[PDB]
Design a protein around this nucleic acid. Structure first.
Ligand SMILES: [Mg+2]
Ligand SMILES: [Mg+2]
Ligand SMILES: [Mg+2]
Ligand SMILES: [Mg+2]
Ligand SMILES: [Mg+2]
Ligand SMILES: [Mg+2]
Ligand SMILES: [Mg+2]
Ligand SMILES: [Mg+2]
Ligand SMILES: [Mg+2]
Ligand SMILES: [Mg+2]
Ligand SMILES: [Mg+2]
Ligand SMILES: [Mg+2]
Ligand SMILES: [Mg+2]
Ligand SMILES: [Mg+2]
Ligand SMILES: [Mg+2]
Ligand SMILES: [Mg+2]
Ligand SMILES: [Mg+2]
Ligand SMILES: [Mg+2]
Ligand SMILES: [Mg+2]
Ligand SMILES: [Mg+2]
Ligand SMILES: [Mg+2]
Ligand SMILES: [Mg+2]
Ligand SMILES: [Mg+2]
Ligand SMILES: [Mg+2]
Ligand SMILES: [Mg+2]
Ligand SMILES: [Mg+2]
Ligand SMILES: [Mg+2]
Ligand SMILES: [Mg+2]
Ligand SMILES: [Mg+2]
Ligand SMILES: [Mg+2]
Ligand SMILES: [Mg+2]
Ligand SMILES: [Mg+2]
Ligand SMILES: [Mg+2]
Ligand SMILES: [Mg+2]
Ligand SMILES: [Mg+2]
Ligand SMILES: [Mg+2]
Ligand SMILES: [Mg+2]
Ligand SMILES: [Mg+2]
Ligand SMILES: [Mg+2]
Ligand SMILES: [Mg+2]
Ligand SMILES: [Mg+2]
Ligand SMILES: [Mg+2]
Ligand SMILES: [Mg+2]
Ligand SMILES: [Mg+2]
Ligand SMILES: [Mg+2]
Ligand SMILES: [Mg+2]
Lengths: 158, 59, 263, 206
RNA sequence: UAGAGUGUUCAAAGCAGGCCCGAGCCGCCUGGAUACCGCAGCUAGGAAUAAUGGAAUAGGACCGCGGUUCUAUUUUGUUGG
RNA sequence: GAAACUGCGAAUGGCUCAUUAAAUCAGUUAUGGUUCCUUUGGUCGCUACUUGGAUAACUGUGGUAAUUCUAGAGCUAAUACAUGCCGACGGCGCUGACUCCCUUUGUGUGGGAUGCGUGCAUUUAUCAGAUCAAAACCAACCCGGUCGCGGCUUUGGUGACUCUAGAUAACCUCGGGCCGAUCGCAGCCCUCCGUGGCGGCGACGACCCAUUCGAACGUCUGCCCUAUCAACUUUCGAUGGUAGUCGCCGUGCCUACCAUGGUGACCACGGGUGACGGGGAAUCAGGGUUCGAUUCCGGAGAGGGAGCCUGAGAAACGGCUACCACAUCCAAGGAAGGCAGCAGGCGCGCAAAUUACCCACUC
């Protein structure tokens, strides 16, 4: 938490400064670091974890530098092995019109999951939005996790 | 060679700058008057608001 | 290849509301770059020989325009493919007549002569608002004009009545529920009615309703509404039949009763 | 030439794609600048739409700033010490963004002295006597506490910083791409970045 | 493409054309519709049929209360304790 | 008014369908992640009555078999090329010798000469970007007025900005940003006799902002046949993270370190296509089957591959350079070339028109 710099370069939030004035607090005090966060719009409440937390991710939509714009989609999680990003699945039904019948199809998508959400499990539903291309194959950031369908995360005393 | 023509041209070329300064001063002054006037209605609305707060705070 | 901008326009691909024929020849005038979009404009060449019949071939238009007779918003335009458009006020001094480009209710421009004490002001629709250097507020209208120092209550989607010798906006109508409006896009093109509603879907194409003088209602997109009146009282003059868009079962009856087969 | 096209490289599934066209001009590459240290040598290139673009080779001076004191002064650049991406740029002294450099730190001393009327990292009291003390103590009586007490309770230059001036070389970080703006600007290390990079330099090299 | 109007001399076509004074009208009327445009995306009503979910070692609502904790910046005119 | 320098255009148009199967293309959306000749509207004030040297056409002498080959000498222009003023600064901030009253001082006063910076734009760093629900004691204190009480506060915009505007400290591209050493019609006042002065209308150029015509990259869904193609992908970047290089901007686009990932029976990956995609065409009770090189829209290519100059725009071939394959001229030293534009010819084949006329119509 206080140790977050592991790479070969210092990690800090830009648009944030460390003043060096008024040294008298007494036996402890402020961590000496405020936090930068912003709102997303469209009705999405920023997670309190993003505010109170202490982490660095230039791509996290709630603190870092990305804008959400265009399509909004949702899908169920299917893999999280790459770091800070996950793999989700979307199932739909194509329509063959010779016959009058549907046929099942799916498509996998890589999205980027900030460390704000921490308790995601394979099977969770997640609502994601559209960003600028953040990597070769990543165009979508996670906006809101949920386990609201059956076989839920925790047992029925919530 | 400096004929009367080229002197006329320079005279006009600076005359235009003079006119532009004239226009800037006039426009700035007028808009400032109007904007300040708008501020008055703004504050009068604000004061009729805090005057109305003295009513619905009742009973 | 395409490696740069194109400069010809094929006759079939041209806009439909120009009402061009099919068998003259392969090209169409291709309006030159201007203040009005390429699909929404009406070049000056198409207004003088396909509508007013003043000229007959392209060269006659070129030698009508060269003599400095035609005025588009006071100024004297010499380019025959100049893109005139909605709210522009052509003036032909040598004859003493004036016109206003407004959509007729079938969704196309039509000739609309106006009184010369009216062709001194035109309406514009506000598109942008920004604060320039040193703190000066600006304005951008639908025909690219830039007004410096506008009143601090005029906002987007509003309408402003300017003068053609000064700019310097005079009046302004504010977009809200109850004012008149003319519609300038899509299916409902050239209809008039009170705005009566506006829904707002954040981030995508807010929708607007309208209501004619005969109960007929018809939604549209907000970026296609153009306020032309404070309420029930259009400021600028209107074409005959006033945007009422009668159905074909009515258009037939009027055609039959008037028996407009001659004069 | 060299190019930055997407289409030359394979897709998610691991399958190749066959070439779709000849290399366009808007996919253009051009070679690295590799700014060294020395007397100025700035070239220019013409980029898409006129728009001169100044490539920099062999720079020497930088407009570095001191965030706490709001000072900023054109300063000589002495050396490069640590590079956070590849290490063989410090062995060849190439000067790119987010490098770490030693600068001369003299104009900051001059500003601090003349503003706070106090001495920074000094060695003795012999050299300060023949000159420059005529600036530290003055004619003034009115002014000399009317303002210089406003400059007291504030001259508390950090220990990590104060220990640097005694050699006259300051750690700084570049914040500008020299190869695209021709300039090599940045800021001077404060606070916790200082401890970070002190640890890193002492750790890797030597 | 389907479809409306219009004697190209009829038709295929085309988007035209129609009226009266001999010229002395220095003209007038009117058209250049409409329907279709699968899927996918957008928008608001309906809730039959088909998926899907809520509390079983519980937790729903009434300002019901005690313990404990972080913290917001207003007023007491402002500024600071 | 020939020629010639200068500017602009030559990147549109025309032709063909070899390539190419999530590619191209269609509908749908996004640039808050970029560039934009031109047009339209804004913007244009921190030797000067006018500077410099040097070229073409033209005169004259030439070389080679040969080319839209060019050398030497003698002249001379600019909106080419290259320098560089005048006006009108009376600006304010920081500096502070001083001096002026009450408190010596400190702290409460007001001026203040002397000095540095003081237009827009570029690059880095910082600051602020307000109002929220009320009370009680301490110090200085505005105001209603006096020797301890009631009463007050400040651009614009978005669904959303590390937006727009503002302040501070600096920085500056020179030979490598801007603020007119240019041109044509029509006139006037003179403490007055052609100078000092000032009044109109345009052409041109130009910084940045917007607008226009675009262009570029990106999101969702959509494809013919094949299992006698079942596993593919990776330090020769394959999926991701951190920092940079580069680029018009987003991005393994590329480099360094790190992790071991990504795709597949919902057909991945490989192979074939007499496959350029679509608007559409033929037949058609209802459902369908087959076709789409071909006049509209999108893409791609000028014998095959590759590299680049100039420009706002080209990886351009009616542009240049080199290799491969062809082919022409020769005095054997050298030079020159690209009809899948319009006609025309050979070849190929079952298979396809004249080496005509004209800018009058559309542009
Ligand atoms: Mg072309
Ligand atoms: Mg090409
Ligand atoms: Mg044109
Ligand atoms: Mg440019
Ligand atoms: Mg038909
Ligand atoms: Mg017919
Ligand atoms: Mg179709
Ligand atoms: Mg649909
Ligand atoms: Mg519904
Ligand atoms: Mg409980
Ligand atoms: Mg020439
Ligand atoms: Mg050109
Ligand atoms: Mg190809
Ligand atoms: Mg294939
Ligand atoms: Mg293949
Ligand atoms: Mg696709
Ligand atoms: Mg499209
Ligand atoms: Mg697309
Ligand atoms: Mg031009
Ligand atoms: Mg202009
Ligand atoms: Mg000579
Ligand atoms: Mg990375
Ligand atoms: Mg990067
Ligand atoms: Mg594997
Ligand atoms: Mg696997
Ligand atoms: Mg394949
Ligand atoms: Mg086909
Ligand atoms: Mg083929
Ligand atoms: Mg059928
Ligand atoms: Mg085709
Ligand atoms: Mg073929
Ligand atoms: Mg053909
Ligand atoms: Mg084509
Ligand atoms: Mg397109
Ligand atoms: Mg050939
Ligand atoms: Mg050019
Ligand atoms: Mg080429
Ligand atoms: Mg060509
Ligand atoms: Mg050539
Ligand atoms: Mg050659
Ligand atoms: Mg050719
Ligand atoms: Mg031929
Ligand atoms: Mg034969
Ligand atoms: Mg035949
Ligand atoms: Mg034959
Ligand atoms: Mg012609």
């Amino acid at each position: 938490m206080a140790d977050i710099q592991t790479e070969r370069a210092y990690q800090k939030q830009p648009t944030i400064f460390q003043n060096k004035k008024r040294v008298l607090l007494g036996e402890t005090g402020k961590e000496k670091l405020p936090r930068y966060y912003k709102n997303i719009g469209l009705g999405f409440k920023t997670p309190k974890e993003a505010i109170e937390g202490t982490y660095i991710d230039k791509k996290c939509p709630f603190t870092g530098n990305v804008s959400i714009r265009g399509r909004i989609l949702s899908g169920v999680v299917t893999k999280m092995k790459m770091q800070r990003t996950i793999v989700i699945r979307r199932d739909y039904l194509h329509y063959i019109r010779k016959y009058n019948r549907f046929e099942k199809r799916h498509k996998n998508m890589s999205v980027h999951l900030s460390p704000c959400f921490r308790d995601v499990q394979i099977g969770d539903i997640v609502t994601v939005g559209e960003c600028r291309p953040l990597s070769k194959t990543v165009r979508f950031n996670v906006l809101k996790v949920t386990k609201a369908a059956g076989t839920k995360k925790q047992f029925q005393k919530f | 060679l400096v004929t009367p023509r080229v002197l006329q041209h320079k005279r006009r070329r600076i005359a235009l700058k003079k006119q532009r300064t004239k226009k800037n001063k006039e426009e700035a002054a007028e808009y400032a008057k109007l904007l300040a006037k708008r501020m008055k209605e703004a504050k009068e609305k604000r004061q009729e608001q805090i005057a109305k707060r003295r009513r619905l705070s009742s009973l | 290849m395409a490696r740069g901008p194109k400069k010809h326009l094929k006759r079939v691909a041209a806009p439909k509301h120009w009402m061009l024929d099919k068998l003259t020849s392969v090209f169409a005038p291709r309006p030159s770059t201007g203040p009005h979009k390429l699909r929404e404009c009406l070049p000056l060449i198409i207004f003088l020989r396909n509508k007013l019949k003043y000229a007959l071939t392209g060269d006659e238009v070129k030698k009508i325009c060269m003599q400095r007779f035609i005025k588009i918003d006071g100024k004297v335009r010499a380019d025959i493919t100049y893109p005139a458009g909605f709210m522009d006020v052509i003036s032909i001094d040598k004859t003493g007549e004036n016109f206003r480009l407004i959509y007729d209710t079938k969704g196309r421009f039509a000739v609309h002569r106006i009184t010369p004490e009216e062709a001194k002001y035109k309406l514009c629709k506000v598109r942008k608002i920004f604060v320039g250097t040193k703190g000066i507020p600006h304005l951008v209208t639908h025909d690219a004009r830039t007004i410096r120092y506008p009143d601090p209550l005029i906002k987007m989607n509003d309408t402003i009545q300017i003068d053609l010798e000064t700019g310097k906006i005079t009046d302004f109508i504010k977009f809200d529920t109850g004012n008149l409006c003319m519609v300038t896009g899509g299916a409902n093109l050239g209809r008039i009615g009170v705005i009566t509603n506006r829904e707002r879907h954040p981030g995508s194409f807010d929708v607007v309703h309208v209501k004619d003088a005969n109960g007929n209602s018809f939604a549209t997109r907000l970026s296609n509404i153009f306020v032309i009146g404070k309420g029930n009282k259009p400021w600028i003059s209107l074409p005959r039949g006033k945007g009422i868009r009668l159905t074909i079962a009515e258009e037939r009856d009027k055609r039959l009763a008037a028996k407009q087969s001659s004069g | 030439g060299i190019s930055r096209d997407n289409w030359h490289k394979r897709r998610k599934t691991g399958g190749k794609r066959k070439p779709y066209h000849k290399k366009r001009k808007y996919e253009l590459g051009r070679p690295a600048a590799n700014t060294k240290i020395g007397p100025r040598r700035i070239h220019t290139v013409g980029v898409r739409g006129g728009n001169k673009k100044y490539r920099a080779l062999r720079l020497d001076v930088g407009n570095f700033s001191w965030g706490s004191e709001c000072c900023t002064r054109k300063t000589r650049i002495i050396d490069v010490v640590y590079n956070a991406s590849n290490n063989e740029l410090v062995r060849t002294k190439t000067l790119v963004k987010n490098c770490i450099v030693l600068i001369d730190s003299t104009p900051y001393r001059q500003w601090y002295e003349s503003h706070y009327a106090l001495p920074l990292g000094r060695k003795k009291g012999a050299k300060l006597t023949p000159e420059e003390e005529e600036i530290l103590n003055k004619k003034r009586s009115k002014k000399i506490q009317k303002k210089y007490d406003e400059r007291k309770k504030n001259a508390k230059i950090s220990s990590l910083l104060e220990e640097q001036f005694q050699q006259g070389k300051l750690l700084a970080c570049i914040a500008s791409r020299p190869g695209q703006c021709g300039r090599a600007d940045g800021y001077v290390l404060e606070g916790k970045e200082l401890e970070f990079y002190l640890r890193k330099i002492k750790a890797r090299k030597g």
